Design a protein around this nucleic acid. Structure first.
Lengths: 144, 46, 124, 115, 48, 28, 162
RNA sequence: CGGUAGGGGAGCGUUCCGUGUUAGGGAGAAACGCGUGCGUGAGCCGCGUUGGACGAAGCGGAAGCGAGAAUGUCGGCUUG
RNA sequence: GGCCAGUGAGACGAUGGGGGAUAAGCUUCAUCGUCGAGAGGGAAACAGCCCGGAUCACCAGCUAAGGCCCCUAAAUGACC
RNA sequence: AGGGUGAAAAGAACCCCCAUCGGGGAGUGAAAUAGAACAUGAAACCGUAAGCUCUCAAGCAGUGGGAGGGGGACCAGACCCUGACCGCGUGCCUGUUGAAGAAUGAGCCGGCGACUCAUAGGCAGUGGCUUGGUUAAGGGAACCCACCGGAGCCGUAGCGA
RNA sequence: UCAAACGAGGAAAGGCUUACGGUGGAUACCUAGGCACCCAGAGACGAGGAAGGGCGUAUUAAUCGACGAAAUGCUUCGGG
């Protein structure tokens, strides 16, 4: 859970295919809200616009539910899953019939502010662990 | 013409990720156009 | 909700026989709001449930108008089952069962089975 | 007297758990999970009997390569010539182990095989 | 004798062998009728 | 096909010390 | 217990599609038992059998059950009942005074079936009254505690002698 | 003390029933997932920040009783 | 004898022959060996050829057939 | 062909994104990861994150040995995950003298899916009586059943048309 | 400094393992609906217009049930 850092926004099963939503969602991973704001303004995809709608309604969410800024805010994971697929019995010649599936997505985009401490030096102190819980909230290479 | 067997998860994730990496290559171009669309004297985009 | 609709022998709904009339002082026996007196307000014979005053609290949210204004929060009672209540005389404060005394006239009245008074109210 | 069950899924889930690290549809796909359980167990058979055979071969060539470091033509067969004539009952080719863990001690072995 | 502790003697009731339930059971596969012929097919078969 | 198993009846031994060995030394 | 075989369901008795020139199996019925739409194989017919057991083996089974019932302090013994105003309080009171719990599943039977003990005994669950008209083995081999009367112990010795 | 067709002996599991309104169970049953455990194995036993009301063992019985195959079949979802 | 099965398409190799063209991994017989129903080792691979009959474990030893330059275990062993 | 949110709609007041659908706070609820696609939710299938590792490599994808590395650890020698490289290993069933077979079958996953029932003969194993054995139909405190009901059946004598 | 030797260390899709999700509705617990026996009873109805339907009837959508221009119902006698 990261101790109250991220903002998770889900999405409806929108009426488009999952894979093109996954190339346009694998583009904007890791980049902050300004770069995705200018790229998804100009990306030449039809899957671009509900993704930009969910980023916009995700950072406006992050500014109204929480109280953050739209500049120190990077996209955390932005996972796109499968949805419900409709079945369309479409006839074709020599008396055949083909199932044409209408696919839907399931977009869940997580946003991530930097709410940091930015400690002065690195040097380890193996004392007062009930302060070591609070001083270390998000770091790397956890030993013991 | 008719395929003899099916592909693995292996080869399919290779080909789909080449397709989506081919989608990755056409947005740093869009980042460059979106960055040149910003404040500056450019004789385009009326 | 077809699993919970009313059963209908010959197009009329099967109504239950119960033991609580309007204007009676019931006590909640066990479930939830245990041990508090009250009048009953509106009766539901098919569920064998009874809504009683100022105890069951269901804070419900209502879109009030069509112009999108004032959206009131209304605190509305719900249906507790008729087997979860007893009757109360205000002279002997004890929750008691029922009984049907046939008095000297033709009419048959309710009766608290442990005390000696009558639940049944006259025409007023 | 309908008899829908769950025992095929525990029967099948045990074999599913044994077939981990099988690289693809040999580790996910049930109708191959079975035959990889089967072929994995017979692989364990023949590789167990041939790990007895194979470590025999490995100690033979290891002590052969240890004895041939003298330079003068003393083979592995002559080490057994004068290893059973001088009565040393069955060192069991673990002198190919102390031939590298204790090379001065195998030099004492061979230098007392000479005398 | 209680309802609990009653049990038949061994040999009094054998289990009926089920056929086609596994080759380790004894009569799996072709259920103990060889490969083909009238003895394996289903029906009246052969007049005695 | 035959699933059988085998649990070999083994014994763990801890070693105390080695003695009685002071005859015919062969140092090099 | 019943189930509908292939010959009973309202499924088709037609050939659904011809024998060849289609890559699909040879399925000649839609009520076929391989298809879950109806039709079963070898299900339970409603069977009303006759498992006969010998007389003098069953009499010896009763005599062995009652014979093993006594001896291990599972039999105390009454002889009479006269219950004016049958009201189940002198019944459970005499049941307590005889040394029998009302919950421990006892069983006891009486000659001639006087009505005031059938009336005062049929409401407690753990015991039910019997009689030599209705003396079974399964109800008496509960065998926790069980009593006789003198007409049942001398009727019981009268029948199952030596 | 290899074993096909096959024959015999001994067992595990499943759902229901007798004991059974059994022991146990909103202080977490069945399920689902887990094992540095035990078996010749079918399997048992134990643990679960998931789930929420049933249900063991033992001694017995009866089966619509055990799945990898039938160009099986019905749903779901792949490949191309 | 009682109850109760399968099997009744065989294949190659040696010997004894017939059919053939003393041709066929050909066909039919008679005795035997293997496979069928037999794993392992030798045969580069390779059902029937040689050794050999697998209850299981050991990071034990000695051998049969066959091998001892390297791939690949053991002799760039000795003497004609 | 399509059943099961809760115990009670108490079915989300109000704020933001916003044309809706939807989403996030807040509020109801014991549970909102029980939100109307709503009860437990498994496999195939699609994903995302973390550890190890693949771009001179020939392989039914394993297995035996195990380089290097990572993780918790307490019997710290143990356990789990990855796999440099070497030896070995001709998918499973059917069915043939002989199948890795380029003979058949199966896209995959989960369910449904096959020596069963009635009545008789025969034999075997366990009983009950051997003062030979045993009842059928039928009667019975609704059924089962106590107890009747000796009709019949089997064995008592064979040979011959 | 030069020459020669080795190719580590971080290096990509992906592979495995683990964790968390989505489609999916197997498993577990049910039921709102069925199946089969036993004991009785009934197999009646219809030119006094039947079984079955069509249309319509409620203050106001559609569907089902009830009802029939006397229509989401009426008269009488009893129960309540």
């Amino acid at each position: 859970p990261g101790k109250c850092d991220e903002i998770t926004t889900r999405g409806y099963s929108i009426s488009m295919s999952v894979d093109k939503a996954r190339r346009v969602i694998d583009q904007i991973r890791g980049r902050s809200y300004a770069e995705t704001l200018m790229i998804l303004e100009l990306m030449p995809y039809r899957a671009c616009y509900p993704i930009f709608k969910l980023i916009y309604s995700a950072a406006a969410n992050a500014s109204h539910n929480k109280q953050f800024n739209k500049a120190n805010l990077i996209i955390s994971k932005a996972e796109v899953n499968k949805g419900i697929t409709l079945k369309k019995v479409k006839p074709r010649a020599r008396g055949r019939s083909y199932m044409i599936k209408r696919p839907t997505c399931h977009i869940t985009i997580v946003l991530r502010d930097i709410t940091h401490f930015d400690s002065y030096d690195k040097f380890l102190e193996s004392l007062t662990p009930k302060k070591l819980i609070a001083l270390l909230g998000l770091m790397s290479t956890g030993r013991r | 013409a008719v395929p003899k067997k099916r592909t693995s998860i292996y080869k399919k994730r290779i080909r789909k990720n080449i397709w989506k990496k081919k989608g990755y290559w056409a947005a740093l171009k869009a980042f460059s156009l979106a960055k040149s669309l910003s404040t500056g004297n450019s004789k385009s985009f009326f | 909700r077809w699993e919970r609709k009313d059963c209908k022998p010959n197009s009329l709904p099967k109504l239950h026989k119960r033991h609580v009339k309007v204007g009676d002082t019931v006590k909640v026996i066990s479930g939830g709001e245990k041990g508090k007196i009250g009048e009953i307000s509106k009766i539901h014979k098919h569920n064998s449930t009874v809504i009683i005053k100022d105890l069951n609290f269901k804070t419900k949210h209502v879109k009030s108008k069509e112009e999108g204004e004032q959206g009131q929060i209304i605190k509305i009672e719900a249906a507790i089952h008729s087997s979860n209540v007893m009757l109360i005389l205000k002279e002997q404060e004890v929750a008691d069962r029922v009984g049907h005394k046939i008095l000297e006239d033709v009419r048959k009245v309710r009766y608290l089975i442990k005390t000696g008074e009558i639940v049944d109210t006259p025409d007023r | 007297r309908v008899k829908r069950g769950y025992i095929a899924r525990r029967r099948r889930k045990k074999i599913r758990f044994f077939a981990s690290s099988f690289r693809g549809a040999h580790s996910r796909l049930t109708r191959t999970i079975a035959q990889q359980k089967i072929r994995a167990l017979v692989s364990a058979h023949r590789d167990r009997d041939r790990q007895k055979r194979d470590f025999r071969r490995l100690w033979i060539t290891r002590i052969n390569a240890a004895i041939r470091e003298r330079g003068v033509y003393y083979n592995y067969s002559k080490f057994i010539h004068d290893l059973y004539k001088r009565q040393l009952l069955l060192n069991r080719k673990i002198l190919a182990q102390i031939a590298i863990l204790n090379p001065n001690c195998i030099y004492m072995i061979y230098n007392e095989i000479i005398k | 004798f209680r309802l609990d502790n009653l049990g038949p003697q061994p040999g009094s009731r054998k289990k009926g062998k089920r056929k086609g339930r596994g080759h380790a059971a004894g009569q799996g596969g072709s259920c103990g009728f060889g490969m083909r012929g009238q003895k394996s097919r289903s029906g009246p078969g052969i007049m005695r | 096909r035959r699933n059988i198993g085998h649990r070999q009846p083994i014994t763990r031994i801890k070693i105390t010390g080695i003695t009685g060995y002071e005859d015919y030394p062969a140092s090099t | 217990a019943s189930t509908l075989t292939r010959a009973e369901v309202r499924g088709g008795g037609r050939k659904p599609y011809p024998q060849k020139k289609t890559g699909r199996a040879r399925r000649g019925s839609q009520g076929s038992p391989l298809r879950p739409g109806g039709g079963v194989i070898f299900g339970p017919k409603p069977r009303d059998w006759t498992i006969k057991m010998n007389k003098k083996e069953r009499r010896l089974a009763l005599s062995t059950a009652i014979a093993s019932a006594v001896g291990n302090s599972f039999v105390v013994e009454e002889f009479a009942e006269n219950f004016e105003k049958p009201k189940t309080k002198d019944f459970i009171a005499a049941m307590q005074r005889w040394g029998l719990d009302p919950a421990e599943k006892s069983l006891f039977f009486l000659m001639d079936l006087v009505e005031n003990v059938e009336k005062s005994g049929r409401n407690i669950r753990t015991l039910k009254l019997l009689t030599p008209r209705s003396l079974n083995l399964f109800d008496v081999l509960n065998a926790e505690k069980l009593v006789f009367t003198e007409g049942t112990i001398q009727y019981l010795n009268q029948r199952y002698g030596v």
